[PDB]
Amino acid sequence: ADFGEQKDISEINLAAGLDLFQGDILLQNTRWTFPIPYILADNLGLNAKGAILYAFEMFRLKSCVDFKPYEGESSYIIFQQFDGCWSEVGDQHVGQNISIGQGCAYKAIIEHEILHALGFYHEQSRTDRDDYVNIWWDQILSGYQHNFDTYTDLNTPYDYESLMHYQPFSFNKNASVPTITAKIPEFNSIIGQRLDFSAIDLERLNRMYNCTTTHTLLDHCTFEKANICGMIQGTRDDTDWAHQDSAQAGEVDHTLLGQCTGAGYFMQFSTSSGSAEEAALLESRILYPKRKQQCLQFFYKMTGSPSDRLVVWVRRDDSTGNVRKLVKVQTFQGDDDHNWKIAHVVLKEEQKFRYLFQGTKGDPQNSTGGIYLDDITLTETPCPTGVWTVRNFSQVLENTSKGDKLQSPRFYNSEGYGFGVTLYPNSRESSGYLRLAFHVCSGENDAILEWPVENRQVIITILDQEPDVRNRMSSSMVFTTSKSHTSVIWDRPSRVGTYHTDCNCFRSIDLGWSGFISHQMLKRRSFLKNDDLIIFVDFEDITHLS
Ligand SMILES: *[C@@H]1O[C@H](CO[C@@H]2O[C@@H](C)[C@@H](O)[C@@H](O)[C@@H]2O)[C@@H](O[C@@H]2O[C@H](CO)[C@@H](O[C@@H]3O[C@H](CO)[C@@H](O)[C@H](O)[C@@H]3O)[C@H](O)[C@H]2NC(C)=O)[C@H](O)[C@H]1NC(C)=O
Ligand SMILES: *[C@@H]1O[C@H](CO)[C@@H](O[C@@H]2O[C@H](CO)[C@@H](O)[C@H](O)[C@H]2NC(C)=O)[C@H](O)[C@H]1NC(C)=O
Ligand SMILES: *[C@@H]1O[C@H](CO)[C@@H](O[C@@H]2O[C@H](CO)[C@@H](O)[C@H](O)[C@H]2NC(C)=O)[C@H](O)[C@H]1NC(C)=O
Ligand SMILES: *[C@@H]1O[C@H](CO)[C@@H](O[C@@H]2O[C@H](CO)[C@@H](O)[C@H](O)[C@H]2NC(C)=O)[C@H](O)[C@H]1NC(C)=O
Ligand SMILES: [Ca+2]
Ligand SMILES: [Ca+2]
């Protein structure tokens, strides 16, 4: 089924019958002291609470903005489920209300409302607007012309990619003719995006609040500089990892994939010579975690022996102040797929540490290759519960007919529920878009688990593949499993699901979004880097927010 098709704030508030300033602004110093105190109100639905907390994580992962639960502070933000989506711009000193209505529970919409509370206003309302966009007054609904009036000093250009900008179809009298068009033609496909903060959105936010760091980013490494991101090579090992440069025919670095000469560097450990169980260590610089859980993401390839082994280790403080204690975290091993692969590893370091990669030779004679590393990042966040790579996605998008589908591997959540994803690359329901939809899977735990599965938030994300989290605009969508999903869709998959021979399992009816992303949006940015599509999934209980 379709859950709910995505809608912009202008259409939501128009359907709710509001007449707010610039659509979502209530008018009745202006800069906040971090952390901003918040109250999640009783009337605010369970999905909305979880989505607001997920939006606060995005702020702590891209900015120095921070939020705390209320304790009797003077100024605060109270989040409620009144009519429409709206916010009061800037600190009001006595507290302010942010409204997240029905159909308003989306990362990009909540980020937009929080940016109003931080004191930002829409981009088409800047005095310089007329130089960058056309406003088609003859296409606006009568009485709504004031929503296009012009109304600071952060010294930045006009941002067509801004999370604050209105869509081409804002307040239209006709559904086919836009009220806004860009004076640079390419941007008619871009204006009014609902993915993430733009780069300029973050630069303005940083200039406004004196930010130069991020609460939940520890490290990243593309290996493009000569000092290799402060990583070092030990001597309690047999050999060394080489810093190769994409020059050799048929070898290309993940960061650039051969788009530039001389640039594009990866770490390599060769396995085609010497003796078995020879190894090499690559070790990070010392890191000081602020939270008790971290996620290490990286890209790798293994063209060598099936007996070769990439292993991730941590070295941590021995409790005297010396980072010398080892823990083995994770092991990776090869198969017939010689393309680049993505890996995620959970770390739980409460004290200072260094993350380590060990490459190991297996049978050197049955090896004609090596272990390859690029594009690391380390964030003070959970890892994605499931990850699905779809290969040759451009070829899939040309070959699949409307209503054909792909299905993921079966994943498992921390509670033990099985889940997966259904992808229709060519939608029948929205022509020119993907449909991504969630399904629950039968698994070995089904007998002890509660049914139907309810109060469990699903987050689906299409990864932007850019190595620095600040620069990423990953498309994201959220729902909470509910009793109201009937055709309850979330009952035990043996009773309400269809058996499939690929997973050897039952899979539920799919629920999610037609029009998750357009084909045009996937063909830009870094969503289809290497012609690989990467989808992330979480399936997490939010009943503790009740
Ligand atoms: C020698 O190594 C090959 C493959 O390893 C190769 O090493 C270098 C030459 C590389 O450049 C690559 O070409 C390659 O990594 C071994 O062949 C492999 O055997 C395994 C185990 O039988 C196969 O895995 C299985 O394959 C079957 C289907 O055939 C599946 O049903 C199983 O689920 C499982 O995946 C693997 O596919 C196969 N690979 C190839 C390319 O043939 C070979 O066994 C090994 N020989 C010795 C003496 O160790
Ligand atoms: C947040 O919104 C609520 C609801 O609109 C405001 O409470 C109202 O306050 C006015 C003025 O005191 C009263 O006339 C209404 O009867 C109140 N309504 C309700 C349901 O309480 C509240 O003042 C707003 N401000 C904040 C930040 O709490
Ligand atoms: C919205 O605009 C579209 C595009 O101009 C309108 O479609 C045209 O309508 C006129 C009058 O019926 C026809 O002569 C054209 O042949 C239509 N062109 C296309 C491309 O369909 C549409 O009717 C408009 N809708 C409203 C309510 O005004
Ligand atoms: C994606 O498409 C490419 C191109 O067809 C595939 O690469 C070919 O793989 C076959 C079988 O191994 C080789 O004989 C060709 O020489 C390869 N061509 C090129 C240009 O590399 C690739 O395997 C496909 N990937 C997947 C997994 O779908
Ligand atoms: Ca060494
Ligand atoms: Ca690189």
Residue numbers in the entry: 35 to 62, 72 to 194, 200 to 535, 542 to 600
Article excerpt on this structure:
The zinc-dependent metalloprotease meprin α is predominantly expressed in the brush border membrane of proximal tubules in the kidney and enterocytes in the small intestine and colon. In normal tissue homeostasis meprin α performs key roles in inflammation, immunity, and extracellular matrix remodelling. In contrast to meprin β, meprin α is secreted into the extracellular space, whereupon it oligomerises to form giant assemblies and is the largest extracellular protease identified to date (~6 MDa). Here, using cryo-electron microscopy, we determine the high-resolution structure of the zymogen and mature form of meprin α, as well as the structure of the active form in complex with a prototype small molecule inhibitor and human fetuin-B. Our data reveal that meprin α forms a giant, flexible, left-handed helical assembly of roughly 22 nm in diameter.
The zymogen form of meprin α is plugged by an α-helical pro-peptide that sterically occludes the active site. The pro-peptide forms a small helical cork which plugs the active core and thus sterically occludes the active site. Cleavage of an exposed flexible loop, defined by residues L61-L67 located distal to the active site, releases the pro-peptide and exposes the catalytic core of the active site. Accordingly, the steric occlusion of the active site represents the major autoinhibitory mechanism. Secondly, the zymogen is converted to the active state by proteolytic removal of the pro-peptide. Comparison between the cryo-EM reconstructions of the latent and activated states reveal subtle conformational changes about the M12A catalytic domain. The subunit is a compact triad comprising the globular M12A protease, MAM and MATH domains. The meprin α M12A domain is typical, containing the catalytic zinc ion within the active site.
